[PDB]
C-alpha cells in the first residue's frame, strides 16, 4: 500500500515516512499541492494531505485531485476547527485528523479506509 504524504513540514514528513515504513507502507512525499498533483497517479492508495502550504494549499489540491481521482484522502492539519473538518470532508476527504495527533490513531484511520478499499476490490473481483 502506497501513501502520498503531502506536507511542507520536512521534519514531520521524515518522522511520518519512517513511522509508516515501519508499519509496512510505501511512502512518497510532496511538499506542496503542485508537487502532490504531479506525483499523484494510479499507484497511490491514500493521500495524507496538509492544508496550509506554499504554491497550492491542501483545500485547492483536494478540489483539483477530486476532479480526476477518487483516491482516498485524509486531511492531517493544524486546521482543526469544526468548520475546517466539515469543509475538508465536504470537499472530498474520507477522513480529517487535526494536529497535534496520536500516531496510533493516524495509523488506525489509515488502516480503516484501506480496509474499506480492499473490501471494495474483493467484492469487485468476486463479481468479476
Can you give the binding site for Mg ion, defined by CB under 5 A? 8, 50, 52
Binding partner of 93, given Mg ion, its own copies, none, CB within 5-8 angstroms per partner class: its own copies
Between residues 68 and 70, which has the closer beta carbon with respect to its own copies? 70
Peptide bond preceding 70: is omega within 30 degrees of 0, i.e. cis?
Answer: no
- Check: CB of residue 50 under 8 Å from CB of residue 9: yes
- Check: CB of residue 35 under 8 Å from CB of residue 10: no
Which of 7, 72, 77, 79 binds its own copies (CB under 8 A)? It is: 72
Q: Is 95 in the site for its own copies (CB under 8 A)?
A: yes
Strands 73-77 and 26-30, by their bridges, are unpaired
Question: Cβ 109 to its own copies, closest distance in Å?
Answer: 6
Q: Is 78 in the site for its own copies (CB under 8 A)?
A: no
Query: 55: phi > 0 → left, psi -120 to 50 → alpha, else beta; which?
Result: left
CA 123 to CA 128: how far, in whole Å? 9
- Reported as type and span, the H/E element at residue 64 is helix 58-65
Q: Is 124 in the site for its own copies (CB under 8 A)?
A: yes
Q: Which stretch binds its own copies (CB under 8 A): 6-14, 22-30, 44-52, 87-95?
A: 87-95
Site of interaction with its own copies (CB under 8 A) = 70, 72, 82, 85-86, 89-90, 93-95, 102, 104-105, 108-109, 111-113, 116, 119-120, 123-124, 127-128
Amino acid at each position: 500500500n502506497k501513501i502520498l504524504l503531502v506536507d511542507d513540514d520536512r521534519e514531520l514528513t521524515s518522522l511520518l515516512k519512517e513511522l509508516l515504513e515501519m508499519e509496512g507502507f510505501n511512502v512518497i512525499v510532496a511538499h506542496d499541492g503542485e508537487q502532490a498533483l504531479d506525483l499523484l497517479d494510479d499507484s497511490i492508495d491514500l493521500l495524507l494531505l496538509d492544508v496550509m502550504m506554499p504554491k497550492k494549499n491542501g483545500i485547492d489540491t483536494l478540489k483539483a485531485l477530486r476532479q480526476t481521482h477518487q483516491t482516498p484522502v485524509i486531511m492531517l492539519t493544524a486546521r482543526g476547527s469544526e468548520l475546517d473538518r466539515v469543509l475538508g470532508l465536504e470537499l472530498g476527504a474520507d477522513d480529517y485528523l487535526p494536529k497535534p495527533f496520536n500516531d496510533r490513531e493516524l495509523v488506525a484511520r489509515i488502516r480503516a479506509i484501506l480496509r474499506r478499499s480492499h473490501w471494495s476490490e474483493q467484492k469487485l473481483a468476486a463479481a468479476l
